[PDB]
Design a protein around this nucleic acid. Sequence first.
DNA 1: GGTAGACCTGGA
DNA 2: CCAGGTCTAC
Length: 311
Amino acid sequence: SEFGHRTLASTPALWASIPCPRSELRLDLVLPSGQSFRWREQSPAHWSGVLADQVWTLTQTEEQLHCTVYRQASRPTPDELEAVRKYFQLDVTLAQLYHHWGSVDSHFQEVAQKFQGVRLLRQDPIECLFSFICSSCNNIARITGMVERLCQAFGPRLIQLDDVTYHGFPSLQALAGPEVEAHLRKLGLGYRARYVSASARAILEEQGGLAWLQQLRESSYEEAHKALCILPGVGTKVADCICLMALDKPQAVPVDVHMWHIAQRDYSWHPTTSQAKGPSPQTNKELGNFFRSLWGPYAGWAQAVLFSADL
DNA sequence: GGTAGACCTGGA
DNA sequence: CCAGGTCTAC
Ligand SMILES: [Ca+2]
Ligand SMILES: [Ca+2]
């Protein structure tokens, strides 16, 4: 009982709750949907993972979000739950965002009704950078497996629940270390093992370390996007993922073949400027402008919602 | 200078 | 053998 992953109904004295309606958030729609890859539904409706350098389990009812942290056991403190608030960017009201997109997009109107609770996670820049560098020519199941082994290999050991040992995401110096590539290739990352290693070294040995990456949150989206592309293994898509998911740039719209199919089938979209009939540097850039023009400042979040509905 | 092909490797 | 992302040879 005092062992393994906890459940709201088996260790109540250790569960604090954050007032949150299921319309404002649906863990089952945001946690395993390709944003973060370190969340596991260890037990039904219960999600465990590393947040703010600690292991947590989250489960929700209808008006509450129940949280328990694994650091002397005791329910989460005020400051701790506040961290969870920040991670789920709760001050950002979805009821308001859905109303807006819906009123300017009749297609979002219908489709979005059945998929409330989809928001964007405010992740850490490094985790995003390397997680998303691994996303190349890949899928969520495979990315998750890769990222899981990468953290098992180079991440600080946090704690152990049942037969699961949690690790923090690797630091920059860890990934920049000698022979990390050879080691990551043994973990099946393929050519992605090269980009991880190079970007780790590039940031530390050319860009001015961690702080460089951080400062991008205070930079403009167009400025932050251009910065990230410098890094080896980081293209336009990954740059937009990092901008949208870790650099507080909600108007960033990562364009990929998926978004393309949603554009042609749901909006009869066609490229205007670019002469390429299909995806290309020009056309994808154009597609991104289309949705930012369509949904506005949060075109990135709108996309998330549409991607889920398309699942 | 916009556009094929390789990069890893698991499915085709 | 080649994606579906990035990087590079014409
Ligand atoms: Ca690049
Ligand atoms: Ca339609």
